RNA sequence: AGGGAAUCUGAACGAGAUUCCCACUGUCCCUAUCUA
RNA sequence: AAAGUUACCACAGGGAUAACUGGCUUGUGGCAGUCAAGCGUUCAUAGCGACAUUGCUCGGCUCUUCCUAUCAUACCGAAGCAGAAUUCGGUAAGCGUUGGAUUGUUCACCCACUAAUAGGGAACGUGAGCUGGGUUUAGACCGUCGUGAGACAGGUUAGUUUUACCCUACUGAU
RNA sequence: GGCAUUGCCGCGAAGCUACCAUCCGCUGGAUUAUGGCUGAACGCCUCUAAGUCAGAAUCCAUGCUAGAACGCGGUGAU
């Protein structure tokens, strides 16, 4: 059996990682950072609750 | 790679003195063989 | 040989030296396991079969025609609690297996009692000679 | 797979595009790679390479020289022979154990005057030097004169042994 | 031992000394032979010999 | 064994054979012992090496002996076919030399181990071991000629065709370069040269075809004018349960007289007299009727340029060789066209769907969008299946609103009565 | 009111011995837990 | 009359040493001849002579670590290597190297499974991690009775390193 | 309920636990054999001599574990 550090399998997995396999992670990251940006505005509204 | 075992260059005193006895043995043979 | 598609792990209930019943109408009533084909290898561990695994097994109580020759045997009933992917853990009443050639083709014409879901999935011709599945 | 499945393929499609370039450059590299192997190859592979390469030089000397010449025109741990009257023979050999493995019956004798070797059975052990005990035991150490059976067949009945059968396999003798 | 008993005169089992003592050997002798003119054909064949006794 | 022999372990040329067996005994056995050890370990060391080299040569020799087909025990066609292609006496001389050499090596090993249990020094023991393996080497050095022969026979028998003497066969004969190469070329898939000279073909080429649901094999032959190539053809005629298709060139071509074909046909007549002969033509016309004087012959005129008469010759050959309530069908199926694989204009299957969507094991098939519903807006089904300890499917029926309202009537019939106080 | 059947040994035997057949068990596969 | 001889030599006595890696060890035998690079004190006819070649022929249970001389797994080269399967060879020690019946002296092997069930070291590795079967009432000295041939339950004797609430490695902890 | 050298029996939480249960166990450079490029030595050639690309389960890293109690750092507290 091919090892975990078998050179050809590492290169085949690098063929994967430049396709769909990274793009889904690079969409998920944008959705996570979006909700992180959404988390500032809620807390800023609770700043303006006291500021009222 | 897995670098294999290296031979020593330390000649032990038993080796070194045994070398001298083997050398002098080769002399005594060569002096006899010279006569024939 | 013979097994269709992939094979997934279910618990091992039938080691080497276990007497299971015979389920087909070939002639044999029981079966004695001697070796398990396609098993792991530890130190001191016996080869243990499960449901739907081809073992090499001898007839102990049956027709003399089916004896004199050690032959492949696919286990159809386990009686040890294995797990299905649909939530439940299940087990049968007794250990039973059916005799076949190395190709996976059945000698008998019908299999009595329930046949396991996993065994009938992996072996097509067992499901061909099946009366009851599950 | 019919008969000549690659020869017909050559005779219809060719070898390669670069089959002649690869071959010619490889044969031109082999002049270097002989020397690149001779200065590498540590160990047993070096000794085997040196022996094969010495052989490949002497054979070439023979080709060139022949062309130039055709241009013009207690138990004993030594090997013994025991005669066929073994069953109750030792009168004077109380505890002189001679095992059956060490008994060689047919000496590999060569003829001097005609360079032919006849593998013949030993009849009698005559005169072993070093020990006159060994003459009576039948020991076949180097220098022993033995009697040779000429049943299979000018010939001399006696042969003097030349090898040390304790070391090598057989007994090797030369006729007198 | 039964088919021996009905095809011979006196059937005696031994396993003598100078056997292994651990091995499951029997040397059974069957002295005296009937030599019948009518031999039962279904008897001597191994298909009917090892026909197992029914349950209790 | 049966028809063909490709599966033979290779034959080393007796110098390399030594370099395999002797190197393996150097690598696989322990190699380092002091002179200062006990004599018992020195003995056991060299005994282990003599024996292991013994098993080495014997293993390689046994592979040769069991590997090659036992010539006089196989089959009468193959016994004689190998006898034509190879000097049968020398083929048995070579294998006899290997069978001799194996017994020799066995004798050597058994000798020197027995001689070895009496060694007194490491030197004596070493000299005896060197004596043993050197003696084995001398035996194998005497095998440089038969093993060189055995490699060539291994290579050439490995490429020989597999004829079946029990299937329906038909020999294809005639003078060398009549045009019978074009016949087997245009009857089956087998590449046989029609090169304009005498002995183009050098062996028995085989072509398989199927007619009347049966396996047939037509055997092309080099031709008869005696040679090893020529006698191969004649013994193929003699030993095969077959019919012979003798081909004639009634033309300027071939470079041989038709009268010589007549002379050869009537000369070789005895050994194909039992085979029910067919003759195909690819004072003067009267001497074709001289050929017709044979008990079992038929004459046919054909052209290889057209593909109908070549098939008709086959039809007559195979014919000679054999003697020797209403169903429900929906109109949506009847009106439907056939699936042409090389059509630019047809429906795309799921096979092409998964390729266009990318990959075999990566595409997930949508079970939805393929089932029939009243509204295709609710195609993407959720279906709860469980609500609070009790599964939905057990509660699920049509007219549950009317059935609920029946139970609502059964509410008010118990509401005013006074069960809830 | 633990079996059973043979055999070796001095027909049942005797906690004689051996072998087999049937039953049983953590001896083991493969250990896990509790108490003193 | 008895005498010569003894390495045919059998028993008692006196001498002389045995048994120290001086890099050990591995795969290709030996004897005789055929060539034959040279050297022989000149030099082939003072002789030695390599590779070839020709003659017939004490065992086994369990763990740790190491070696490669690798059985499998990884990548290669050669091979009539159509495909599959395989044979030889190279790099390669990263990781693997199974379960039962086996006791006239096992210094044998059976029958499967497995990708494969590779070979060795840790000088008395692993008998003060241990058992399964062998000496005969087995060491040494002295005596008594004895033709060549052995006994005597004579008589005197020796058989100390094993425990360390040492030492320190190793694990873990302040 | 006292008590039974835990008198005996059934079930059994918590805890502990089993391939008798379940989950999880990686990706970049440098190379070996080898295959090559340009190219000398040597007015051909030549994978190597100066250079140079690829290439093993190999190596070194990434990752994974401990943290030097006499290695260091930043930060809070008067």
Swiss-Prot record, chain B:
Coiled coil: none
Spans annotated as Disordered: 1-36
Ranges of Basic residues composition bias in the record: 1-13, 21-34
Subcellular localization, as worded in the UniProt entry: Nucleus
Origin: domain of life: Eukaryota
More info: Present with 7130 molecules/cell in log phase SD medium.
Free-text domain note: In contrast to other GTP-binding proteins, this family is characterized by a circular permutation of the GTPase motifs described by a G4-G1-G3 pattern.
Reported function: GTPase required for 60S ribosomal subunit export to the cytoplasm.
Family: Belongs to the TRAFAC class YlqF/YawG GTPase family.
Protein name (database record): Nuclear GTP-binding protein NUG1
Protein species of origin: Saccharomyces cerevisiae (strain ATCC 204508 / S288c) (Baker's yeast)
Full protein stretch here: 1 to 36 of 520
UniProtKB/Swiss-Prot annotation, chain C:
Keyword S-adenosyl-L-methionine: no
Alphabetically ordered keywords of this record: Acetylation, Cytoplasm, Methylation, Ribonucleoprotein, Ribosomal protein
Native organism: Saccharomyces cerevisiae (strain ATCC 204508 / S288c)
Highest taxon of the lineage: Eukaryota
Protein name as it appears in the record: Large ribosomal subunit protein uL14A
Subunit structure comment from the entry: Component of the large ribosomal subunit (LSU). Mature yeast ribosomes consist of a small (40S) and a large (60S) subunit. The 40S small subunit contains 1 molecule of ribosomal RNA (18S rRNA) and 33 different proteins (encoded by 57 genes). The large 60S subunit contains 3 rRNA molecules (25S, 5.8S and 5S rRNA) and 46 different proteins (encoded by 81 genes).
Broad class of where this protein is predominantly found: cytoplasm
Compartments it resides in: Cytoplasm
Swiss-Prot record, chain D:
Residue ranges with Basic and acidic residues bias: 1-39
Positions of the UniProt region annotated as Disordered: 1-42
InterPro entries named among the record's database cross-references: NSA2_fam, Ribosomal_Se8/biogenesis_NSA2
Position of sequence motif Nuclear localization signal 2: 50-57
Keyword Transmembrane helix applies: no
Keywords assigned by UniProt, alphabetized: Nucleus, Ribosome biogenesis, rRNA processing
Protein's GO biological process: maturation of 5.8S rRNA; maturation of 5.8S rRNA from tricistronic rRNA transcript (SSU-rRNA, 5.8S rRNA, LSU-rRNA); maturation of LSU-rRNA; maturation of LSU-rRNA from tricistronic rRNA transcript (SSU-rRNA, 5.8S rRNA, LSU-rRNA); ribosomal large subunit biogenesis
Record bears the keyword rRNA processing: yes
Motif, Nuclear localization signal 1: chain positions: 14-21
Pfam families registered for this protein in UniProt: Ribosomal_S8e (PF01201)
Subcellular location: Nucleus, Nucleolus
Subunit relationships: Component of the pre-66S ribosomal particle. Interacts with NOP7 and RRP1. Interacts with RSA4 (via WD repeats).
Record-stated family: Belongs to the eukaryotic ribosomal protein eS8 family. Ribosome biogenesis protein NSA2 subfamily.
Function in brief: Involved in the biogenesis of the 60S ribosomal subunit. May play a part in the quality control of pre-60S particles. Under normal, rapid growth conditions, high levels of NSA2 would allow the progression of pre-60S particles through the ITS2 processing.
Further comment found in the protein's record: Present with 8660 molecules/cell in log phase SD medium.
PANTHER family from the UniProt entry: RIBOSOME BIOGENESIS PROTEIN NSA2 HOMOLOG
Protein name in the entry: Ribosome biogenesis protein NSA2
Organism: Saccharomyces cerevisiae (strain ATCC 204508 / S288c)
Taxonomic classification: Eukaryota, Fungi, Dikarya, Ascomycota, Saccharomycotina
Swiss-Prot record, chain E:
Subcellular location(s) of the protein: Nucleus, Nucleolus
Subunit comment: Component of the nucleolar and nucleoplasmic pre-60S ribosomal particle. Interacts with the snoRNA-associated proteins NOP1 and NOP58.
Protein name per its UniProtKB record: 27S pre-rRNA (guanosine(2922)-2'-O)-methyltransferase
Main function: Required for proper assembly of pre-ribosomal particles during the biogenesis of the 60S ribosomal subunit. Specifically methylates the guanosine in position 2922 of the 25S rRNA at the stage of 27S pre-rRNA maturation. Also methylates the uridine in position 2921 in the absence of methylation of this residue guided by snoRNA snR52 at the stage of 35S pre-rRNA maturation.
Family: Belongs to the class I-like SAM-binding methyltransferase superfamily. RNA methyltransferase RlmE family. SPB1 subfamily.
Native source organism of the sequence: Saccharomyces cerevisiae (strain ATCC 204508 / S288c) (Baker's yeast)
């Amino acid at each position: 059996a091919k090892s975990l550090r078998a050179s050809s399998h590492l290169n085949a997995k690098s063929v994967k990682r430049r396709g769909v396999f990274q793009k889904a992670v690079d969409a998920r990251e944008q959705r996570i950072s979006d909700k992180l940006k959404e988390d500032l505005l809620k807390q800023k509204l609770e700043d303006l609750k006291k500021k009222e | 790679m897995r670098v294999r075992k290296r031979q020593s260059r330390r000649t032990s005193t038993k080796l070194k003195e045994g070398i001298k006895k083997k050398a002098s043995a080769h002399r005594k043979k060569e002096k006899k063989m010279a006569k024939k | 040989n013979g097994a269709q598609g992939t094979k997934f792990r279910i618990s091992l209930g039938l080691p080497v030296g276990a007497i299971m019943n015979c389920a087909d109408n070939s002639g044999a009533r029981n079966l004695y396991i001697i070796a398990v084909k396609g098993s792991g290898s530890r130190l001191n561990r016996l080869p243990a079969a499960s449901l739907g695994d081809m073992v090499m097994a001898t007839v102990k109580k049956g027709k003399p025609e089916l004896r004199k020759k050690v032959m492949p045997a696919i286990v159809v009933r386990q009686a040890k609690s294995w797990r299905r992917r649909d939530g439940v853990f299940l087990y049968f009443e007794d250990n039973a297996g059916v005799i076949a050639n190395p190709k996976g083709e059945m000698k008998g014409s019908a299999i009595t009692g329930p046949v396991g879901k996993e065994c009938a999935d992996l072996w097509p011709r067992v499901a061909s000679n099946s009366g009851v599945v599950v | 797979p019919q008969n000549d499945y690659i020869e017909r393929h050559i005779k219809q499609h060719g070898k390669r595009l670069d089959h002649e370039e690869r071959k010619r450059k490889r044969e031109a590299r082999e002049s270097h790679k002989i020397s690149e192997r001779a200065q590498k190859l540590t160990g047993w592979k070096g000794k085997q390479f040196a022996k094969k390469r010495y052989a490949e030089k002497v054979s070439m000397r023979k080709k060139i020289k022949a062309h130039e010449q055709s241009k013009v025109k207690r138990m004993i741990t030594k090997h013994t022979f025991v005669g066929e009257g073994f069953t109750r023979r030792p009168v004077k050999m109380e505890r002189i154990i001679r095992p059956s493995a060490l008994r060689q019956k047919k000496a590999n004798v060569t003829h001097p005057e005609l360079g032919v070797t006849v593998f013949l059975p030993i009849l009698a052990v005559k005169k072993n030097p070093q020990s006159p005990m060994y003459t009576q035991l039948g020991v076949l150490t180097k220098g022993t004169i033995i009697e040779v059976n000429v049943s299979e067949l000018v010939w001399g009945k006696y042969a003097q042994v030349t090898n040390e059968p304790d070391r090598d396999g057989c007994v090797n003798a030369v006729l007198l | 031992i039964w088919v021996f008993q009905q095809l011979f005169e006196k059937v005696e089992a031994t396993k003598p000394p100078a056997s292994r003592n651990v091995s499951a050997e029997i040397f059974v002798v069957c002295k005296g032979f009937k030599a019948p003119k009518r031999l039962d054909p279904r008897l001597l064949d191994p298909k009917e010999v090892f026909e197992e006794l029914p349950d209790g | 064994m049966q028809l063909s022999w490709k599966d033979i372990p290779t034959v080393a040329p007796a110098n390399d054979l030594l370099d395999i067996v002797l190197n393996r005994t150097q690598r696989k056995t322990p190699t380092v012992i002091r002179p200062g050890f006990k004599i018992t370990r020195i003995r056991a060391f060299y005994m282990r090496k003599v024996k292991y080299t013994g098993e080495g040569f014997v293993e390689k020799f046994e592979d040769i002996l069991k590997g090659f087909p036992n010539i006089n025990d196989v089959h009468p066609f193959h016994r004689d076919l190998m006898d034509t292609l190879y000097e049968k006496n020398h083929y048995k001389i070579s294998l006899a030399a290997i069978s001799r050499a194996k017994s020799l090596v066995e004798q050597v090993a058994r000798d020197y181990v027995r001689l070895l249990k009496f060694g007194q020094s490491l030197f004596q023991c070493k000299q005896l071991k060197r004596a043993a393996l050197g003696r084995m080497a001398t035996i194998v050095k005497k095998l440089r000629d038969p093993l060189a022969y055995l490699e060539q026979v291994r290579q050439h028998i490995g490429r020989l065709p597999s004829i079946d003497p029990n299937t329906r066969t038909l020999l294809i004969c005639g003078y060398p370069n009549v045009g019978k190469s074009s016949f087997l070329r245009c009857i089956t898939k087998s590449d046989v040269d029609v090169q304009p000279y005498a002995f183009t073909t050098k062996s028995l080429y085989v072509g398989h075809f199927d007619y009347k649901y049966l396996r047939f094999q037509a055997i092309d032959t080099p031709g008869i004018l005696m040679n090893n190539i020529e006698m191969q053809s004649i013994y193929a005629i003699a030993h095969l349960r077959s019919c012979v298709l003798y081909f004639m060139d009634l033309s300027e071509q071939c470079g041989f007289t038709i009268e010589a074909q007549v002379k050869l046909f009537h000369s070789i007549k005895p050994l194909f007299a039992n085979k029910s002969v067919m003759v195909v033509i690819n004072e003067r016309a009267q001497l074709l009727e001289s050929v017709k004087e044979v008990p079992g012959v038929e004459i046919m005129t054909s052209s290889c340029q057209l593909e109908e008469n070549v098939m008709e010759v086959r039809n007559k050959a195979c014919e000679k060789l054999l003697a020797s309530r209403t169903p429900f069908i929906p109109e949506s199926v009847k009106n439907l066209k056939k699936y042409d694989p090389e059509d630019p204009n047809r429906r795309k299957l799921a096979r092409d769907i998964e390729a266009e969507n990318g990959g075999a094991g990566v595409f997930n098939v949508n079970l939805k969008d393929k089932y029939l519903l009243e509204d295709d807006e609710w195609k993407n089904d959720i279906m709860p299946e469980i609500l609070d300890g009790k599964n939905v499917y057990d509660f699920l029926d049509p007219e549950i609103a009317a059935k609920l309202q029946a139970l609502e009537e059964e509410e008010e019939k118990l509401e005013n009565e006074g069960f809830y106080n």
